[PDB]
Amino acid sequence: EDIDVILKKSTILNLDINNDIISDISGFNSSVITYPDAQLVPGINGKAIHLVNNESSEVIVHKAMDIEYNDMFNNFTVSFWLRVPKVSASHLEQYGTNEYSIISSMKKHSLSIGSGWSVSLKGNNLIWTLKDSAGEVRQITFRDLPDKFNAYLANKWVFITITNDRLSSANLYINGVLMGSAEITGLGAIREDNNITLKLDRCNNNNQYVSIDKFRIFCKALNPKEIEKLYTSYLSITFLRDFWGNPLRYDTEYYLIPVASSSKDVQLKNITDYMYLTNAPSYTNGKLNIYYRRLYNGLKFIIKRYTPNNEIDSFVKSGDFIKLYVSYNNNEHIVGYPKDGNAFNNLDRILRVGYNAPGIPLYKKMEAVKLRDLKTYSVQLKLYDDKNASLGLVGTHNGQIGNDPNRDILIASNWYFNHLKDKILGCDWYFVPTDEGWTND
Ligand SMILES: CC(=O)N[C@@H]1[C@@H](O)[C@@H](O)[C@@H](CO)O[C@@H]1O
Ligand SMILES: CC(=O)N[C@@H]1[C@@H](O)[C@@H](O)[C@@H](CO)O[C@@H]1O
């Protein structure tokens, strides 16, 4: 009756990466073969598998004897974290009708049309397919969201769960939410290969890649409550994450975007002065049904270690004390609040960049934290004075400075601390690094 017990108990395969070696830690001890070009990259909670488009980039799981036939007629669930780069507008046109498998239990080099299951991608569709020994087929075709900023197959880590109840349906869940279904009654025996293969199969795009992590198979159809628990069990709050879902790091350029106003980029009035929000330009393609606010405009920021401490980790952990800089023209300019500097009457302190008035204390110590909204890859930043008193969470305040136009100006405010359960909050920030999985069209 413990969901954790149930999850544990029904697990019959669990790909784990430890000491740079991939193995099955289910207890079934299935043998895992890693070919030379399967790579390891940063994942959701440790390293993940990365597959490029060549023959030597694959990971094969040879089923242990005990679990060789558990999906001929039994219910099963497959789960894994998945990361797919955003498909360019030219690649949707050129390769959009090309379906390629990434994970499959179906033979193909001996038995003319492999019965079994597979996970595939086709343009912006994620496809689950079941095929019985009579060649009968059931498919779930999930069509991704047109807005690529909020979509599931657009360079962010997302959690996939597909449950198969032989008496009723197969259901596809993304980040714990039901997004696709298919009635699978009438499917007969599902008699797969003795191998589960992770590899790009039949992909015409030579530069395509995918990343997969925590590949897991359960011998039952999970219910929604078990899936929810499964999904959140991976979200460890110890390390902060960037916009793509990877570990946030020190000494790396990030473009900041407010979670509550995702249409807005950050801009600098002048060095020594304040920051404010501007509208990001957008990309629209009606014929391909794709659109998104363009990334990588606005300020670039860098996170630096407040003190060295204990051991140098490249990743930023929740609770870390840091210093934030704006990076432009090969120069770094610290972000802070000058003692007695301009602030709104309610005490929203206006943040300043490269402030350097002689004699004036400049408050720049921050704590990088995760205070809320667990499944979202966002961060909060808490500013302190020199006595280590809270100056508040970094957020924005609407108003005007001098004769400037009215703007959402970056501030630090303690007000946010009494609203941490709200749905949407002005102190949540996305940290976006330039990445090869996302190029604006
Ligand atoms: C030029 C500039 O913005 N300088 C800052 C400096 O003022 C100080 O805050 C330091 C942090 O210990 O980091 C930077 O070098
Ligand atoms: C943050 C803030 O108040 N900035 C303003 C700045 O924009 C400018 O108007 C200046 C004039 O001396 O007064 C302040 O420094």
Give the burial string for 243-270 (b: 16+ CB within 10 Å, else e).
bbbbbbbbebbbbbbbbbeeebbbebbe
Examine the domain organization and report whether 176 and 288 are in the same domain. no
Ligand 1 atom 8 nearest Cα: 334
Distance in Å, CA 405 to ligand 2 centroid: 13
Examine the domain organization and report whether 228 and 301 are in the same domain. no
Distance in Å, CA 288 to ligand 2 centroid: 46
Give whole-number Cα distances, 148 to 85, 133, 434, in Å: 11, 38, 15
Distance in Å, CA 270 to ligand 2 centroid: 10
Q: Is 342 in the pocket of ligand 2 (CB under 6 A)?
A: yes
Question: What CATH number does residue 375 fall under?
Answer: 2.80.10.50
The candidate with the shortest Cα–Cα distance to 406, out of 280, 281, 278, 299, is: 278
Examine the domain organization and report whether 317 and 209 are in the same domain. no
Taking the CA of 274 as reference, the closest ligand is: 2
Q: Which amino acid belongs to residue 118?
A: S
Resolution (Å units) = 2.1
- Which one of 235, 258, 293 terminates a domain? 235
Would the CA dihedral through 323, 274, 353, 299 be positive or negative?
Answer: positive
Examine the domain organization and report whether 246 and 209 are in the same domain. no
Q: Is 271 in the pocket of ligand 2 (CB under 6 A)?
A: no
Q: Say if residues 103 and 210 touch (Cβ distance below 8 Å).
A: no
Start-to-end CA distance of the chain, whole Å, equals 50
Distance (Å, rounded) from C-alpha 309 to C-alpha 321? 10
Would the CA dihedral through 118, 122, 126, 127 be positive or negative?
Answer: negative
Examine the domain organization and report whether 345 and 385 are in the same domain. yes
Distance (Å, rounded) from C-alpha 94 to C-alpha 204? 10
The candidate with the shortest Cα–Cα distance to 244, out of 156, 153, 370, is: 156
**Ligand 1 atom with minimal separation from the 362 CA:** 9
Distance in Å, CA 355 to ligand 2 centroid: 11
The candidate with the shortest Cα–Cα distance to 194, out of 68, 26, 32, is: 68
Ligand 2 atom 4 nearest Cα: 273
Choose which residue among 344, 348, 401, 404 to substitute to test ligand 2 binding: the one with the highest number of ligand atoms within 8 A of its C-beta.
401
Examine the domain organization and report whether 224 and 255 are in the same domain. no
Ligand 1 atom 6 nearest Cα: 334
Distance (Å, rounded) from C-alpha 382 to C-alpha 240? 14
DSSP state for residue 270 in the 8-state scheme: S
Q: Say if residues 301 and 324 touch (Cβ distance below 8 Å).
A: yes
The candidate with the shortest Cα–Cα distance to 292, out of 301, 302, 282, 300, is: 282
Q: Say if residues 310 and 326 touch (Cβ distance below 8 Å).
A: no
Examine the domain organization and report whether 251 and 229 are in the same domain. no
Distance (Å, rounded) from C-alpha 170 to C-alpha 181? 6
Examine the domain organization and report whether 212 and 286 are in the same domain. no
Give the burial string for 385-396 (b: 16+ CB within 10 Å, else e).
beeeeebbbbbb
Question: What CATH number does residue 96 fall under?
Answer: 2.60.120.200
Look-up: residue for tokens 């943040």?
Answer: 351
Give whole-number Cα distances, 202 to 51, 139, 198, 314, in Å: 13, 18, 13, 37
The candidate with the shortest Cα–Cα distance to 187, out of 114, 129, 132, 115, is: 132
Backbone angles phi, psi at 415, to 5 degrees: -50, -40
Label each residue of 306-332 as H, E or C. Answer: CCCCCCCCCECECCEEEEEEEEECCEE
Q: Give the gyration radius of the chain's Cα atoms.
A: 24
- Dig out the tokens for 14 from the structure: 């669990």
Q: Say if residues 266 and 411 touch (Cβ distance below 8 Å).
A: no
- Dig out the tokens for 421 from the structure: 């359960």
Cα 393 to the chain's mean position, in Å?
24
3-state DSSP helix/strand/coil % of the chain, to nearest 5: 10, 45, 45
Q: Say if residues 48 and 401 touch (Cβ distance below 8 Å).
A: no
Burial of 427 (0-12, 13-18, 19+ CB in 10 A): buried
DSSP secondary structure letters along 59-102:
EEEE--GGGSSTTSSS-EEEEEEEE-PPPPHHHHHHHTT-EEEE
Distance in Å, CA 268 to ligand 2 centroid: 13
Examine the domain organization and report whether 225 and 159 are in the same domain. yes
- Dig out the tokens for 220 from the structure: 């039952």
Look-up: residue for tokens 């280590």?
Answer: 388
Distance (Å, rounded) from C-alpha 300 to C-alpha 180? 38
Residues 6+ apart with CB under 8 A from 323: 303, 304, 305, 306, 334, 335, 364, 365, 366
Ligand 2 atom 13 nearest Cα: 402
Distance (Å, rounded) from C-alpha 255 to C-alpha 17? 31
Backbone angles phi, psi at 168, to 5 degrees: -145, -85
Q: Which amino acid belongs to residue 165?
A: D
Distance (Å, rounded) from C-alpha 5 to C-alpha 306? 41
Query: What's the full length of the chain, in residues?
Result: 441
Distance (Å, rounded) from C-alpha 148 to C-alpha 434? 15
Examine the domain organization and report whether 92 and 28 are in the same domain. yes
Looking at the structure of the chain, the number of domains it has is 2
- For residue 114, the tally of other CB atoms under 10 A from its CB is 19
Q: Which residues line ligand 1 (CB under 6 A)?
A: 323, 333-334, 354, 364
Domain assignment of residue 312, given as a range? 236-441
The candidate with the shortest Cα–Cα distance to 176, out of 188, 190, 163, 164, is: 163
Taking the CA of 276 as reference, the closest ligand is: 2
Examine the domain organization and report whether 308 and 362 are in the same domain. yes
Q: Say if residues 219 and 161 touch (Cβ distance below 8 Å).
A: no
What is the CB-side half-sphere exposure of residue 137 using CA atoms within 13 A? 13
The candidate with the shortest Cα–Cα distance to 243, out of 287, 301, 186, is: 301
- Which one of 235, 253, 268 terminates a domain? 235
- Which one of 178, 203, 235 terminates a domain? 235
Q: Which amino acid belongs to residue 183?
A: E
Distance (Å, rounded) from C-alpha 296 to C-alpha 192? 45
Distance in Å, CA 398 to ligand 2 centroid: 16
Examine the domain organization and report whether 78 and 223 are in the same domain. yes
| Structure determination technique employed | X-ray
Backbone angles phi, psi at 432, to 5 degrees: -105, 110
DSSP state for residue 137 in the 8-state scheme: E
Give the burial string for 208-234 (b: 16+ CB within 10 Å, else e).
bbbbbbbbbbbbbbbeeebbbbbbeeb
Choose which residue among 267, 268, 273 to substitute to test ligand 2 binding: the one with the highest number of ligand atoms within 8 A of its C-beta.
273
